């Protein structure tokens, strides 16, 4: 549940970044034992990307269930990083990126044969997928298929897709969490029954995320505004990018950091004081 800091490099080049929960839970571990087995049978180490592919949409429903979009969504973050860690662009400290490298006859720091590799099965990488999402939800719908389509997030930057799910799951959950803080209290002027509760929830939940953002920002800003974001800023990225559930944060967030006061961030008057009370 926690975005931790468990990437290569988090002293260097990589300071700042985190990791994605989803990505620190998806299983794709090679054994130095396996090298062999994998570097001379090709095949069997497709069938192993492959099941790895398909244990991960396997896994999403355990976590979403019946929650269709949010799963679907998720595969396409974890295709993209399955992708990164064939190429070798991924960022995971124990990712055996190491051992792919040697495997796909590449090794010693280079990236042309992994590079290839990957480039002819993303196709039947996602074709697995596919068939792991029919498996775990019966028959796949004919107007359900246009979300299902082939994605591109493959050859984009790792991080500014981790930042995006960040933004995403951030805006979702405090969206989410400032709904409650609607349904506990409509007026309640001064101590009353239960809506605190939920102000201490949202006020916690920003001021987790407030260091959190600062972290993802502080690597954005270094890196990756510099030289090819559109130059745009951080919240004014995201703002075009992932639809308008990234704007929350630059709705609320862009102007300042007024991260410092959580209860600043409500549109709603109202409800404000009975959390600042």
Same mark, same amino acid.
């Given at each position: 549940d926690t975005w931790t800091?468990?990437?290569?490099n988090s002293s260097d080049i990589n300071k700042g970044v985190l990791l994605p929960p989803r990505r620190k839970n998806l299983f794709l571990k090679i054994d130095e034992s396996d090298i062999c087995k994998y570097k001379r049978d090709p095949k069997l180490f497709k069938d192993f990307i492959y099941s790895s592919a398909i244990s991960e949409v396997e896994r999403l429903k355990k976590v979403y269930g019946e929650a269709k979009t949010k799963v679907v969504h998720a595969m396409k973050y974890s295709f993209a990083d399955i992708g990164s860690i064939i190429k070798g662009d991924?960022?995971? #400290?124990?990712?055996?990126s190491d051992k792919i490298g040697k495997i796909l006859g590449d !090794?010693?720091?280079?990236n042309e044969k992994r590079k290839k590799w990957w480039d002819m099965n993303k196709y039947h990488i996602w074709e697995s997928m596919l068939s792991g999402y029919k498996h775990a939800y019966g028959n796949i719908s004919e107007n359900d298929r246009k979300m299902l389509?082939?994605?591109?997030?493959?050859?984009?930057?790792q991080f500014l897709r981790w930042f995006q799910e960040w933004t995403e799951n951030f805006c979702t959950k405090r969206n989410e969490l400032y709904e409650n803080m609607v349904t506990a209290c409509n007026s309640a002027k001064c101590d009353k029954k239960e809506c605190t509760e939920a102000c201490k929830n949202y006020s916690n939940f920003i001021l987790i995320k407030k260091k959190e953002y600062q972290s993802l920002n502080s690597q954005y800003d270094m890196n990756y505004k510099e030289t090819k974001? #559109?130059?745009?800023?951080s919240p004014e990225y995201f703002k075009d990018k992932c639809? !308008?559930?990234?704007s929350c944060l630059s709705e609320?967030?862009?102007?300042?950091?007024?991260?410092?006061?959580?209860?600043?961030?409500?549109?709603?008057?109202?409800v404000k004081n009975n959390c600042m009370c």
């Amino acid at each position: 549940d926690t975005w931790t800091d468990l990437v290569k490099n988090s002293s260097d080049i990589n300071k700042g970044v985190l990791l994605p929960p989803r990505r620190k839970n998806l299983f794709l571990k090679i054994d130095e034992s396996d090298i062999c087995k994998y570097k001379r049978d090709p095949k069997l180490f497709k069938d192993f990307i492959y099941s790895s592919a398909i244990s991960e949409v396997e896994r999403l429903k355990k976590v979403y269930g019946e929650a269709k979009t949010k799963v679907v969504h998720a595969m396409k973050y974890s295709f993209a990083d399955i992708g990164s860690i064939i190429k070798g662009d991924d960022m995971m #400290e124990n990712n055996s990126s190491d051992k792919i490298g040697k495997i796909l006859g590449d !090794g010693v720091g280079q990236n042309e044969k992994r590079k290839k590799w990957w480039d002819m099965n993303k196709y039947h990488i996602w074709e697995s997928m596919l068939s792991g999402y029919k498996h775990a939800y019966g028959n796949i719908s004919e107007n359900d298929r246009k979300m299902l389509d082939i994605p591109n997030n493959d050859d984009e930057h790792q991080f500014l897709r981790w930042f995006q799910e960040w933004t995403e799951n951030f805006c979702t959950k405090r969206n989410e969490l400032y709904e409650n803080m609607v349904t506990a209290c409509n007026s309640a002027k001064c101590d009353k029954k239960e809506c605190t509760e939920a102000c201490k929830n949202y006020s916690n939940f920003i001021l987790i995320k407030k260091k959190e953002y600062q972290s993802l920002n502080s690597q954005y800003d270094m890196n990756y505004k510099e030289t090819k974001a #559109e130059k745009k800023e951080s919240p004014e990225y995201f703002k075009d990018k992932c639809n !308008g559930e990234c704007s929350c944060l630059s709705e609320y967030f862009k102007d300042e950091t007024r991260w410092k006061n959580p209860y600043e961030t409500l549109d709603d008057t109202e409800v404000k004081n009975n959390c600042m009370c």
